[PDB]
Amino acid sequence: SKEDEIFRIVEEKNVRFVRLQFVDVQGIPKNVAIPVGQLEKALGPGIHFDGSSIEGSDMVLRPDPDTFRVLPWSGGTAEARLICDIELPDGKPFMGCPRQVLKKNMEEAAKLGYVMNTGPEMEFFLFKRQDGMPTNIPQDRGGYFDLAPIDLAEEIKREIVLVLEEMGFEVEAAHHEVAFGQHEIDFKYDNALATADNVITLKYVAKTLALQHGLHATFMPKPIFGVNGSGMHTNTSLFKDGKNAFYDPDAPDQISDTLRYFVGGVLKHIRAITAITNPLVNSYKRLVPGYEAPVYITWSGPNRSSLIRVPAPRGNSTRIEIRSPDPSCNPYLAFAAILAAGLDGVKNKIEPPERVEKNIYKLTEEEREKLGIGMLPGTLKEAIECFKEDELLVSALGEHVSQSIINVAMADWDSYRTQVHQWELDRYLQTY
Amino acid sequence: SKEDEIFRIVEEKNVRFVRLQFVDVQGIPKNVAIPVGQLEKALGPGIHFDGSSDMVLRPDPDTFRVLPWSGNGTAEARLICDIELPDGKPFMGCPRQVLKKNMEEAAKLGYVMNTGPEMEFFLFKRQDGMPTNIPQDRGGYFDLAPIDLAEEIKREIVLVLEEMGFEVEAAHHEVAFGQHEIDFKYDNALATADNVITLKYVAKTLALQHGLHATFMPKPIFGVNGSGMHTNTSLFKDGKNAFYDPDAPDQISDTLRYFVGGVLKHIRAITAITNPLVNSYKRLVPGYEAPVYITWSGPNRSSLIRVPAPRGNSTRIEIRSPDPSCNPYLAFAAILAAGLDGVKNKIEPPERVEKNIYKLTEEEREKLGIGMLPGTLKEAIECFKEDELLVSALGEHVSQSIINVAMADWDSYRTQVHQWELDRYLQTY
Ligand SMILES: Nc1ncnc2c1ncn2[C@@H]1O[C@H](COP(=O)(O)OP(=O)(O)OP(=O)(O)O)[C@@H](O)[C@H]1O
Ligand SMILES: Nc1ncnc2c1ncn2[C@@H]1O[C@H](COP(=O)(O)OP(=O)(O)OP(=O)(O)O)[C@@H](O)[C@H]1O
Ligand SMILES: [Mg+2]
Ligand SMILES: [Mg+2]
């Protein structure tokens, strides 16, 4: 069994502590450190803990044996991790657990022979530290696809990719992004659950290795005004009966009906999905015209950088690139929301709007309402109100998770709206 | 095959990452870092990337080199890539593809151009992690240590290059403080351009390791010598040097005169490519080793084009106008196209101005028909725009991007209020 293989790795690597890793509703990693003597108890009846932390009472941690990994930073004593699912004391799964929510939505898709594969493009910033505290000052003075010595973070990015490969992770490519100190690490495509586990691991690894070098890695959507913001472009494809359900060689543009319907479904609920995929108040400072980030609700081919883009590759690589999410979203909930909205498009038979190949930003406002082009929410409150009314996403994510998202977002918005920012003093104090 | 040899070097040296290297229209190196697991995919169907839309990187197997500075023992490697459209057609906007096209067109007439550049550069100090224009040493022409403090770093630069199949001739301290020169042997225009990009990357990387900043800027300091890229050039027809004619006067063939005549006819336009920055025209001023007047002569006078004394296989012309901030792929392509038009149409060059030129008065220079190189970047771009031969040789895509980038820089520079103006007028007016 897998448990026997875990204990073999324990004695070989001299693992003394195990971290029972899990995630709250906001995508923040949480854990319980246990000595290796308690590992047999963790894999058997499980470890008890207070679960008010998930919301961000008594519950149990159920480690997934497939996620056992030794943390490649040695302490002679090594450490290991285990991604755990949350269960209630009786044995039933906790429907407030984000990982359980994605698992449920994937099981509902598997009922119709569908499996969703996701391949995200993870953008992030590497900032300097001042007096032990993190800052928003770029550590390098680099640009798009730049090379060293312009890109000063080549050693740390090299370490991130190596540390990930040591944890059964396959990376496609990494490069410097448009903004100063911005970087991108694109992963290979995998099932929504393995990808979401991998997304959490990347954020943890990048932030840990950045600290080791006196730096701070952040996946914040818009840490600096006037420069490009970090996005999480999600390459998505559906696979029915082993074949790519988005490929039809006889149809026009070799795109199947299931693609156009899936696109139609996700665009129907995209205002509501934005509350999950763009959950911070800062996420809406990224959804501003002038940068790679999509703002208008449109879909097109590769030539135009729209919200949903259908790349040229065909065959087994047929896919859609949803470019609205940012890397601060909870990946378990982001993929669950996209899967539920996209499957409603396939099931309820929803035709998507006409593809817009013209440059949207170059068009005038007068032409956009003629074609029925909408806008993504401008504020967090505006997306939360749209999410509140979308009963499909509320039922797909569960009432417990949906309520927790609304409560956390409203608490942040009510605090942000009352604040007096420096911009207001700079604009009005001297004159008025 | 070469792919099998690459994978043998991978397991031998323990390469874990490879750099898919390429250059933009301005000669700046760009890359995509991939783990060694994706190397089979890169050498096969290629790696996709956003050029802005989407494109594919096609690595040149002959350019696979292990970076001598070891990784965390995880070795690292690099591959110079050609850009290509998704369907399979080479991208006409790629600078390396432009030189390759101009090379094939020369090869159809049995011609192969060999280039040997003299790379001048500066080594400056760093203040608070930012680069400065303060020389690291207070050395002069051909000076020796301890006057030349960069003797250890230059020795490391040459060593690192030799480890990557690089053959160099000599290195020395130049006229200005903290200025140096590294001259390497002659090779075909493509290998030389690849080597020029590698030289800049290696020097800047090694300088940062020592807390210094290497720069190939044409004129980083006012009042001192500027960095130049003197390009030794020669054509080879059917294995032999097309510039050597033992029966002709001065042992120089008609092909040399016609090639010189062609490059001097389009030299105003070539200046926009070989001297592409606004700062490049602060180097093209009298008083330093940089040529200003459009003339050609023997080794006695320092002119735009100089015919050195060596004959035989070493017969060549030294084009001294370029600076090391130019895109080498486009600089050599522009030289080859203008030079081949001279050969093809038999354009005679002007008389060799052996008389010392800077000392002559403007009135005489006007009588002899001696012209001048463009004084500003805008002036060179206007001349480049009208040169139909060069626009067609570099392609409309590349020519348009050069004009856009240069105009955007010029329009920003011309509106700026520099400190010189405040120092000259604020107190009095
Ligand atoms: N079917 C798919 N579903 C989701 N994402 C995909 C899919 N195919 C490709 N991608 C994403 O696109 C990126 C690269 O696209 P590409 O055109 O190379 O297809 P590919 O499947 O990655 O090719 P290969 O199988 O050789 O790796 C990958 O990083 C991956 O995340
Ligand atoms: N035929 C040629 N074409 C272009 N450049 C040349 C040629 N011959 C020499 N050069 C360049 O001129 C410089 C000085 O050449 P030199 O007088 O030493 O003759 P050389 O021995 O043939 O040089 P090299 O050893 O580099 O071939 C060298 O750096 C070289 O790159
Ligand atoms: Mg993208
Ligand atoms: Mg010289």
Tab-separated table of C-alpha atoms in Angstrom, chain A residues 141 144-149 154-155 158-159 161-162 165 171-174 302 309, chain B residues 16-17 19 29-35 38 41 50 52 72 74 76 201 204 208:
chain	number	residue	atom	x	y	z
A	141	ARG	CA	15.230	46.372	-13.383
A	144	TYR	CA	9.641	41.221	-21.220
A	145	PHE	CA	11.623	37.943	-21.735
A	146	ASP	CA	14.770	39.787	-20.491
A	147	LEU	CA	18.074	37.968	-19.788
A	148	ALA	CA	20.678	38.411	-16.990
A	149	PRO	CA	22.197	40.704	-15.740
A	154	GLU	CA	17.524	33.928	-12.524
A	155	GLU	CA	19.144	32.028	-9.623
A	158	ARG	CA	16.131	28.327	-11.201
A	159	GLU	CA	15.809	27.148	-7.555
A	161	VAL	CA	11.681	25.179	-10.738
A	162	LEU	CA	14.232	22.671	-9.342
A	165	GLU	CA	10.588	19.096	-9.986
A	171	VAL	CA	7.222	22.821	-15.556
A	172	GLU	CA	6.890	23.956	-19.220
A	173	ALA	CA	8.789	27.267	-19.214
A	174	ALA	CA	9.680	30.327	-17.077
A	302	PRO	CA	-5.221	34.083	-30.951
A	309	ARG	CA	-8.871	33.194	-26.233
B	16	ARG	CA	19.064	20.803	-15.758
B	17	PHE	CA	17.988	24.066	-17.496
B	19	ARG	CA	18.070	29.062	-22.216
B	29	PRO	CA	19.064	39.420	-25.750
B	30	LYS	CA	15.744	37.782	-24.800
B	31	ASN	CA	15.159	34.175	-23.637
B	32	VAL	CA	12.817	31.442	-22.345
B	33	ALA	CA	14.120	29.225	-19.533
B	34	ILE	CA	12.963	25.590	-19.869
B	35	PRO	CA	13.816	22.530	-17.723
B	38	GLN	CA	11.421	19.991	-22.293
B	41	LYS	CA	10.269	19.176	-27.317
B	50	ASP	CA	4.207	35.456	-27.222
B	52	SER	CA	4.009	40.735	-28.928
B	72	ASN	CA	23.290	25.494	-7.602
B	74	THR	CA	23.185	21.691	-11.497
B	76	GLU	CA	22.920	25.166	-17.295
B	201	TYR	CA	26.043	38.817	-22.322
B	204	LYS	CA	27.856	42.148	-18.412
B	208	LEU	CA	28.027	42.130	-12.073
